[PDB]
């Protein structure tokens, strides 16, 4: 009955914007456009965003605000049989913490390394360099750039590790960076959404400041338009391929972040009559808009490199940490006042990660708080222990083979595990709880029922475009490999045990609670298909 609310409306929006706008808005989205043929990729992107992403984004925020509970208790009260969905979805966000946070650590690392007149990743004559170092990117894989060898042989020391079986020593300047990250995360989420709500005023807004600066600086570079060409030049031949639509689908779902239980928890602190439909639309737009803008930020510079640095666009156009920690710092180093751009760039990368991390962790805390009253009064002691667990396990990420640990989790911990949980999220609400009863809930809150367009998407379109796309992803599957290194198949098994441990909670709690309840079989179904106090 008694529950706290956001100290102000803006707190919520910035918490949702902050969480939804993450580093993948920067490295992955512009790359997908370039690879999939430019503005022609906006079509499948916009389509999957419209039918798949925003409805499910809308759905969680609605559920969260209505049921007024964390992800675990929410599904328990909604569909008691399916309460496992809340379990599955929460411990997914738990797995992501073991990897995603190290990206912020790297950002702070390049930040602390950015105080100097001359950026260390500029030249080839340092001690960590090999004979094969080249000034900038190229085709042949035996010969790296000065930025690549700086990232791998100095920051990571990944060259000292033969695989994920050999982690090697622990790097304490990285552990220190990772510790700093969890200190920031602690003193944010420590006292709850009271402090958290106002903290995100920085972490959500600051990247937009840096974006504008890097946009103008990027567009005033020679050859910037050449990059924009490669970025947006429409080629509609790529619309016909299957995995393009798979790419458009998986990006939209990771970007908007439904299925982590984050949107549920955040909305649970909303007042009942708040308009969550205006919020879902507003936030969804802002997130995609940021991705579109960042594209120009990346490719204006990517063009400048192609034109004045004598490199070819295919070699500098990248996704993942390769783009932000190697390719983009390479260009910054060349242009005048390099030290300034580097400093705001790595600070932007950090604040892009943090607000996302907050949501993931808040999704866990709020969910466990609502289940166990012992945690809520003890909350500061709980999150202290939780991050203690993160840092201790996270020390594996700070090793010399730490990247191999990162790359493993970066794949299996989330992704289509998220897709089957969200699939069940739509099926449970629409076909069990019912669309009529859900639409009635929203009418009580915001005063009007969802248009039938939204109902169709929740009931039909989203489950289909999930199920079909999550199936085509299993067919295009190939064993995890990084560069020349092929992960052992015992490593691939560990990844499935991680990916599976979440998903299997759907039938687990289903089978468990089913046998635990009294009577014959079909009043079981009814008893567990009945909502909380109905």
């Amino acid at each position, epitope marked *: 009955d008694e529950r706290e609310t956001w100290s102000g409306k803006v707190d919520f929006l910035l918490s949702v914007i902050g969480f939804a706008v993450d580093l993948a808005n920067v490295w992955r989205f512009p790359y997908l456009c370039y690879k999939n043929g430019g503005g022609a990729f906006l079509v499948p992107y916009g389509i999957m965003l419209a039918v798949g992403g925003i409805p499910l984004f809308y759905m969680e925020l609605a559920l969260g605000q209505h049921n007024r509970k964390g992800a675990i208790t929410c599904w328990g009260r909604l569909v008691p049989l399916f309460k496992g969905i809340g379990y599955a979805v929460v411990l997914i966000a738990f797995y992501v913490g073991f990897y995603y946070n190290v990206i912020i650590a790297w950002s702070l690392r390049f930040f602390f390394a950015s105080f100097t007149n001359s950026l260390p990743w500029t030249s080839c004559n340092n001690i960590w360099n090999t004979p094969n170092c080249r000034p900038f990117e190229g085709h042949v894989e035996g010969f790296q750039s000065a930025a690549s060898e700086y990232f791998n042989r100095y920051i990571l020391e990944l060259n000292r590790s033969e695989g994920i079986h050999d982690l090697g020593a622990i790097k304490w300047d990285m552990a220190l960076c990772l510790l700093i990250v969890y200190l920031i995360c602690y003193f944010s989420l420590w006292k709850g959404i009271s402090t958290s709500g106002k903290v995100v005023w920085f972490t959500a807004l600051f990247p937009y400041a840096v974006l504008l600066i890097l946009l103008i600086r990027g567009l005033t570079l020679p050859g910037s338009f050449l990059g924009i060409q490669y970025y947006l030049t429409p080629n509609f031949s790529a619309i016909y391929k299957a995995e393009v639509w798979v790419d458009a689908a998986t990006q939209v779902f990771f970007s908007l972040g439904p299925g982590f239980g984050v949107l549920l928890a955040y909305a649970s602190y909303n007042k009942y009559h708040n308009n969550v439909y205006k919020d879902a639309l507003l936030t969804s737009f802002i997130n995609s808009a940021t991705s579109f803008i960042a594209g120009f930020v990346i490719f204006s510079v990517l063009g400048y490199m192609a034109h004045t640095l004598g490199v070819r666009i295919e070699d500098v156009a990248t996704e993942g940490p390769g783009l932000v920690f190697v390719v983009y710092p390479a260009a910054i180093a060349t242009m005048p006042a390099s030290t300034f751009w580097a400093l705001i760039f790595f600070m932007m990368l950090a604040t892009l990660g943090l607000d996302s991390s907050f949501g993931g962790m808040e999704a866990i805390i709020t969910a466990l708080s609502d289940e166990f009253p012992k945690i809520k009064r003890n909350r500061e002691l709980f999150v202290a222990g939780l991050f203690s667990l993160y840092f201790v396990v996270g020390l594996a990420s700070c090793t010399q083979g730490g990247f191999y640990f990162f790359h493993l989790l970066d794949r299996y911990a989330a992704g289509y595990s998220i897709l089957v949980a969200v699939f069940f999220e739509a099926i449970a609400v629409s076909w069990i709880y019912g669309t*009529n009863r859900f639409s*009635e809930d929203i009418r009580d809150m915001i005063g009007f*029922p969802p248009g039938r367009y939204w109902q169709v998407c929740w009931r039909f379109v989203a489950p289909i475009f999930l199920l079909f796309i999550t199936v085509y992803g299993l067919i295009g599957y190939e064993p995890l490999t990084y560069a020349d290194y092929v992960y052992p198949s015992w490593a691939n098994a560990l990844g499935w045990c991680i990916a599976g441990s979440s998903v299997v909670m759907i039938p687990a709690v289903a089978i468990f609670k089913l046998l635990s309840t009294p009577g014959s079989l079909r009043q079981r179904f009814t008893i567990l298909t009945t909502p909380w106090r109905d």
Partner: antibody
Amino acid sequence: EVQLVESGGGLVKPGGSLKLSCAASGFTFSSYAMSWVRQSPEKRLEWVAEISSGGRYIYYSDTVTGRFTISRDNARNILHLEMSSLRSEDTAMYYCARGEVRQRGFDYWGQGTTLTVSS
Amino acid sequence: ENVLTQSPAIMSTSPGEKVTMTCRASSSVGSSYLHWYQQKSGASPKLWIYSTSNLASGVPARFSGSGSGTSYSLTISSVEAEDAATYYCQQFSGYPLTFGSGTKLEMKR
């Protein structure tokens, strides 16, 4: 198209009880919220109660609260109002009105059925 | 409860003239949630204007409405004898739902 028809109502002695009905047709009845609005002999409109589309959300004015019960049948498309311990100030013409959207107001009204509470 | 007071109580108009009637709420009403109803003598009320500015289906363009907060109004540009009725405003912002005291519009001759 849409037709709302109120039935029941008439003379009832104070403290007595009576049940009002509203027959709906011309639309999917299960999709809309229903309310009762009454008009006193002094021609003042007063909202009585609201029932949601699935009947899971109910609201009453403090005047009729606990005495009046608004019910719903989506199968036969009939709205109900069950009054008890009736008083003279309950004398009015009772209206069946839809509906669902709060921001669009009540877009359809019935003919009304008159309740007289007197000894 | 949120009490809506309408003024004037009775109003007399020659055809072709313009009329304005006002609706004042004790508490504040969201603009989206305020509506008007026209009731002719011996008949049920009819939805007339919804969300303060928007004419209901069948309502002639001579009708218009405006307002915000605690103050709203209904205006007829050129009055017709067909427009003689009683007009009740309403707020749906919160429960209990309240109707204005009404403005009776009568023709003069």
